[PDB]
Amino acid sequence: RPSDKPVAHVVANPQAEGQLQWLNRRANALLANGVELRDNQLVVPSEGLYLIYSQVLFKGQGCPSTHVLLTHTISRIAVSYQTKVNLLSAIKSPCQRETPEGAEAKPWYEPIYLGGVFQLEKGDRLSAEINRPDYLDFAESGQVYFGIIAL
C-alpha cells in the first residue's frame, strides 16, 4: 500500500566519524514528494507552511576549562533574500565545574531540540548545523536528526 505531501526526516550518518552529514537512504528516514538533499541542505519544493525540527545530542568524555558553548541553528536562505538567517537556535553550556581533574571521569550527554512552523518558498535551502561537530553522538539510533513536513 498511497502518499501524502512534501516530507523529510533525515538522520546523521553514523559512519561519518566526527562530521554531520544528513542521509535519506537509511532505516526509518524519509525524503520524498520533492524535498531535495543538497550539500547538507533541504530544498523546499513548494511554497507553503512547513514544520521544521531537529535534535542534536552532544556527548563528551571530559570537561575542559574553556566554558564550552554548544550551539545548534536551523538556517534558511531564500530566493527573495540571499543571506543565511537563523530561524531556530539555542545555546547551552554543559560543564559547570573546573574540569573533572581530581576524579577524571566526565561521561556527559546533553541534547537540544528545535521546532517551529514557517512559510517557505520554492528553492529555499534549509540547513541544520552545530558549532562543535566533534562532540556529536550518532552512536545509537535516531539521537541526531533533522526534518521538515508540509502542514
Binding site: 511554497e47 530566493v79 527573495s80 533574500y81 540571499q82 543571506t83 512559510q119
Partner: protein, 107 residues
C-alpha cells in the same frame, strides 16, 4: 541585511545635502511604504521623521533604493537616523530597518 543604509557615521559641517541612501534587498518589501526615524544624541526616545522641508526623500522605484537629504543642517540634528519599509508576501507581513549615524560640527 534586508535593508542597507549606506552612509554610516558621517561627520560634516553645519551645511546641508546630508543624503542617506538605503538599498532594499528583500523582494517582498516595497519602496512605496517607506519610513524614517531619528534619535538624537544622549536621548532615550525614537521620534518619527516627517517628510517635507528639511527632510526630503527621493524614491527610486527602479533601483529599490530611497534616499533622505537633510538640508540647512543645524546642530540639534545630531543623532542616529534609521530607514524603514513595510514588507508583505503571502500570509506574512513585517517591516525592516537599518542603521546610520550623523554628527554635525559648527563654524
Amino acid at each position: 541585511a534586508r535593508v542597507d543604509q549606506t552612509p554610516q557615521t558621517i561627520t560634516k559641517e553645519t551645511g546641508e545635502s546630508l543624503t542617506i541612501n538605503c538599498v532594499l534587498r528583500d523582494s517582498h518589501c516595497a519602496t512605496s511604504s517607506t519610513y524614517w526615524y531619528r534619535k538624537k544624541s544622549g536621548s532615550t526616545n525614537e521620534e518619527s521623521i516627517s517628510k517635507g522641508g528639511r527632510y526630503v526623500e527621493t524614491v527610486n522605484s527602479g533601483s529599490k533604493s530611497f534616499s533622505l537629504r537633510i538640508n540647512d543642517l543645524t546642530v540639534e540634528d545630531s543623532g542616529t537616523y534609521r530607514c524603514a519599509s513595510e514588507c508583505q508576501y503571502g500570509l506574512a507581513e513585517y517591516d525592516v530597518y537599518g542603521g546610520g549615524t550623523v554628527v554635525t560640527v559648527n563654524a
